[PDB]
Structures are given as structure tokens and as C-alpha cells.
């Protein structure tokens, strides 16, 4: 297993080389020590294929090896349009660690276990995303364009919410400051199915959902401003969604995994 | 005119409502010339003059 060591060292050290780079800077010494670092690695990584290719004439992880070495083989050149293609193969250097998954036993075992878990829980995942689509469709016909608001609370129309208005710092009448008037939509709206698919995901993640609840509660009419506590019975939509998706279909996922592993 | 301003100083107007009440009354007394008479009262289950 000497050669396997001879690598499991080099590939991981190359990974840590590609990790401790300089994000914000394009010209530096860290990205020049590590800019010309990958010439010992790239040739020895390619030489492994050359030593092993002639022993055969193709299995699966060898394709990954070919791709991860061709990433360097191509990104060395390319030239021409140096605003793209190099900018995606720069990201595509995140496949060096995945080369170690084949040359280290047990890693294949755990990866295959996770993929068979995918195979077992695909049904629950599909059911959850179907219910996501369903609830998005119901919510579209419930909050379609009603979640608009103006910076000035005294205007309730996009035509009226224009020009400037006076804002007072910390509710002090003696410090007026002019602000413009802007018809701003909510951060997580319900205008179309896709937008609701993200709003409901953020609700199911239990992050920022009170703001959505207390913004949708104030919605009364399309293309109009909000009214304080216009409808409080609309909280039942969010309550039922949290109970059915954020609780039932997640704990069912966990219970499926637990009972399957048991 | 003969304005007489009644200010609700019950318990429920405590907080933001009192701040806007105390400002709005301050800005309607400024729409009065010297030909007009005005007084300010308040009720909290008992009428009085502030």
C-alpha cells in the first residue's frame, strides 16, 4: 500500500494547498507560492494514470481521476477569453479531495451507504417536495401581489407612493429627515409558484417566518398597502404548514432512517 | 372658532399613542390665531383640565 500512501499524502496536501489560498486578491505571494505550487502535484498525479493505464485498456473512479487531472491539464492553457472558462475550472478544482474516496477503503463503504439511504428516502423527499408545490399553489391564490408596501405608511398605492416624505429619527419630531418614497415588495413574496416555493422553504427552516406571518396578516387587497391586523385568521395557513411539513414530514424522515437502520 | 380639545388619557393610550396624541394636540394649537379661544381637557374616568 506504499503507492496508495504515496498519494493519500500528496492529494490531501494539494487539497490543503488549494484551501489556504488568497480569496480576495488576484495578485499576491500566497497565490504565487500556491500559484506555482501545483506543478509537482499535477505531473505526479498525471503520471499515476500513465503507470496504470498500460496495465489495462474503463472503471468508474478512473473517469473521475481523468477529469480531475484534465482540469489542470486544460486550465494551464485555455488563454483567449480569460474572464470565463478559467473562472469555472478554477472552481472545478474542488474535485481533488474526491479522488481520495477511491484510493481509501471504507470511504467507498460509507459513500455507498449514504447513496443507498438516498435510495430509501427518495420517496419521502418526493412527497415533501410535492407537498411544497401544493402549498405554494394554494398560497399563490392567497397572497398574490398583496404583500406590497410603501416606505411611507400613509400611502397605499404604487402611484401614490412616489416622491419624498419626512422621516423622524427615533420618533423625535424635532429631527426631520427627507427620504424618498419606494414601493417595495416583501423579501419573500408569493407572486408566483417558484417564489412561494422558496418562501415556504424558508418557513420550514424556522428562519424569518414571523416576519412573513406578520406581513401576510396585514395584506388585504392586491396592489395595495398593508392594514394593521386586517386578517388574523390567515395565520392558520402558516400553522398548518408548519405542523404538516416542518414537523410531520421531517420527523417521518428521521423515523424512516431510524427504523431502517434498526 | 371656539375649539375645546378633549384628550383621552386612559390606560390604553400609553406608549406610541400618547406620543402622537401629545404631538398632534401641539400642532393643532398652531392653527389658531388670536381671534380664537381654546382650552384643553382630558378624561381618564374623571374630566379635568390639563
Amino acid at each position: 500500500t506504499i503507492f496508495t500512501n504515496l498519494i493519500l499524502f500528496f492529494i490531501l496536501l494539494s487539497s490543503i494547498s488549494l484551501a489556504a489560498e488568497d480569496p480576495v486578491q488576484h495578485t499576491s505571494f500566497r497565490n504565487h507560492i500556491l500559484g506555482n505550487a501545483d506543478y509537482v502535484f499535477t505531473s505526479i498525479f498525471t503520471l499515476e494514470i500513465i503507470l496504470k493505464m498500460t496495465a489495462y485498456g474503463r472503471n468508474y473512479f478512473n473517469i473521475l481521476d481523468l477529469l480531475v487531472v484534465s482540469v489542470s491539464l486544460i486550465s494551464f492553457g485555455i488563454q483567449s477569453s480569460a474572464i470565463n472558462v478559467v473562472k469555472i475550472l478554477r472552481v472545478l478544482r474542488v474535485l481533488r479531495p474526491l479522488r481520495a474516496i477511491n484510493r481509501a477503503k471504507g470511504l467507498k463503504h460509507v459513500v455507498q451507504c449514504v447513496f443507498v439511504a438516498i435510495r430509501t428516502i427518495g420517496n419521502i423527499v418526493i412527497v415533501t417536495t410535492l407537498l411544497q408545490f401544493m402549498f405554494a399553489c394554494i398560497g399563490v391564490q392567497l397572497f398574490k401581489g398583496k404583500l406590497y408596501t410603501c416606505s411611507d405608511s400613509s400611502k397605499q398605492t404604487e402611484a401614490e407612493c412616489k416622491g419624498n416624505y419626512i422621516t423622524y429619527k427615533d420618533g423625535e419630531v424635532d429631527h426631520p429627515i427627507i427620504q424618498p418614497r419606494s414601493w417595495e415588495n416583501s423579501k419573500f413574496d408569493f407572486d408566483n409558484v417558484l417564489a412561494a416555493m422558496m418562501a415556504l422553504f424558508t418557513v420550514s427552516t424556522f428562519e424569518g417566518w414571523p416576519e412573513l406571518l406578520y406581513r401576510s396578516i396585514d395584506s388585504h387587497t392586491e396592489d395595495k398597502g398593508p392594514i394593521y391586523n386586517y386578517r388574523v385568521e390567515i395565520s392558520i395557513f402558516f400553522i398548518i404548514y408548519i405542523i404538516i411539513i416542518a414537523f410531520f414530514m421531517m420527523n417521518i424522515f428521521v423515523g424512516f432512517v431510524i427504523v431502517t437502520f434498526q | 372658532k371656539d375649539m375645546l380639545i378633549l384628550v383621552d388619557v386612559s390606560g390604553s393610550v400609553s406608549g406610541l399613542t400618547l406620543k402622537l396624541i401629545r404631538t398632534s394636540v401641539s400642532e393643532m394649537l398652531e392653527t389658531l390665531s388670536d381671534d380664537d379661544f381654546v382650552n384643553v381637557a382630558s378624561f381618564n374616568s374623571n374630566a379635568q383640565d390639563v
Partner: protein, 250 residues
């Protein structure tokens, strides 16, 4: 007395493969029709997605009867999933009373018909565990309802106590009008539900402490309410939503 052309083309035409596989196509058409809508729609889309509604509802209402006198009434009504489509079509032909004054708008019942898209799922691997899934979740429905009712009572009690402690006390001179209050019963219930799910549970605690005086010995003792609420609510949430899942799924 003369069904020599009725029953032969009743059972052997609603279960004759193509009938199914085309009912699935029409279900996909309906879900496309209801899904393909947004805010500020074009005129043509508004016209077509309004015309096709009854154009599909009439066919599906006919399909009701075509499958009805094929399997009779007993075999039609025994199936639980048959009654789901029964209610869907009933609501579809019923919504033309409240269509007068919107209320339910184009009621999201046309969605709930995509449970009949699991017909395609029917032939998929381990669909005879999804039927078993709902089967168990409906067979143990009495215990499920008892657990849910106990959790709801816990929430109600901690909401009544919440509005008794912090009722009309989140009124400081600060400009904003924070809506995580304990003023009414709906608002107290929403606040308790928000604290129970963990989201911003430390932002209502600060309001409660600042309302009951401030950081001090007697003032900073009301955090016990929020701490007990969080601990007990999470524990009961686990004991309900994981016991139900584990028991029914096993």
C-alpha cells in the same frame, strides 16, 4: 334489462388501461392550468386558465359517473382515496355559488386533486407502503388526536399564562410596534407558537425582562417562564411528532 352494451363498456372501459393513462394526462393538465399563474398575468393566460377550469371539471365529473356504475356504489364508496376525489369533484361543482363574491377565490381545491397524480406513483416501488403509511396514520388516528390535543392544551395554558403575565406590558416609548406581544388570545397563541419552535425565542424574552422592570433580582426572574416553555414544548413536540412517526412507520 338491456345493458348488453353498457356494463361491458363500463368496467372494461374505465379500467381499460388507456382510460387511466389518459386520466393521468388530464390531471397533469389541471395542475399545469392552476400552476401557470402569477401576479400581473397576461390577458391570454387569464382567459385560458379560466376557460379550461370547467372544461376539465365537466370531463372529471363525467368520469365520476362512468366509474360509478362500473364498480357500483359499495365498491366505489369503500375506497378511501375514491372519497377524496369525491370531495374534490363535489367542491368543484359547489364553488359556483361562492364564485359570486370570491370569498375562497378560485379555491385551492384544484390542487388537492394532484393526490390522484399518485396514481402514477401507484405502480412505483414501495407504493404499497405509502398506502400503508396513511393506513397506519389513520388507524392510530385516535391516539394521534389525543396526543395532538394534549399538546394543544399545553399551548393554550402557556398562552393564557403568557397573556396574564405580559398582557399590555410590551408598551415602551420606543418607536416600533413589535408584533410578538401578548395582547389578545390569537397574538398570544402566535407568540407562544413562535417561542416553541425556537425562532426568535430570545427576542421575546428580552422584551419580557425589560417589561417587568429590568435586569435585577425580582425583574430578571420572568425568564423562567420562557425557559420552561421552551424545554417542555420541545420535549412534548419530540414525544408527539417522533412517537407518531416511529410507531406508525415501523
Amino acid at each position: 334489462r338491456w345493458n348488453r352494451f353498457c356494463r361491458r363498456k363500463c368496467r372494461a372501459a374505465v379500467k381499460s388501461n388507456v382510460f387511466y393513462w389518459l386520466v393521468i394526462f388530464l390531471v397533469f393538465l389541471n395542475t399545469l392550468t392552476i400552476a401557470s399563474e402569477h401576479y400581473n398575468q397576461p390577458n391570454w393566460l387569464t382567459e385560458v386558465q379560466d376557460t379550461a377550469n370547467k372544461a376539465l371539471l365537466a370531463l372529471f365529473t363525467a368520469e365520476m359517473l362512468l366509474k360509478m356504475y362500473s364498480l357500483g356504489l359499495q365498491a366505489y364508496f369503500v375506497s378511501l382515496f375514491n372519497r377524496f376525489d369525491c370531495f374534490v369533484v363535489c367542491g368543484g361543482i359547489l364553488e359556483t355559488i361562492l364564485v359570486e363574491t370570491k370569498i375562497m377565490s378560485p379555491l385551492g381545491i384544484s390542487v388537492l386533486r394532484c393526490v390522484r397524480l399518485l396514481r402514477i406513483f401507484k405502480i412505483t416501488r414501495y407504493w404499497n407502503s405509502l398506502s400503508n403509511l396513511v393506513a397506519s396514520l389513520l388507524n392510530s388516528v385516535r391516539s394521534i388526536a389525543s396526543l395532538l390535543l394534549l399538546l394543544f392544551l399545553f399551548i393554550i395554558i402557556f398562552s393564557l399564562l403568557g397573556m396574564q403575565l405580559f398582557g399590555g406590558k410590551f408598551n415602551f416609548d420606543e418607536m416600533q410596534t413589535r408584533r410578538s406581544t401578548f395582547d389578545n388570545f390569537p397574538q398570544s397563541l402566535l407568540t407562544v407558537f413562535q417561542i416553541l419552535t425556537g425562532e426568535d425565542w430570545n427576542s421575546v424574552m428580552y422584551d419580557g425582562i425589560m417589561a417587568y422592570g429590568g435586569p435585577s433580582f425580582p425583574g430578571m426572574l420572568v425568564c423562567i417562564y420562557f425557559i420552561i416553555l421552551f424545554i417542555c414544548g420541545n420535549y412534548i413536540l419530540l414525544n408527539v411528532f417522533l412517537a407518531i412517526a416511529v410507531d406508525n412507520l415501523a
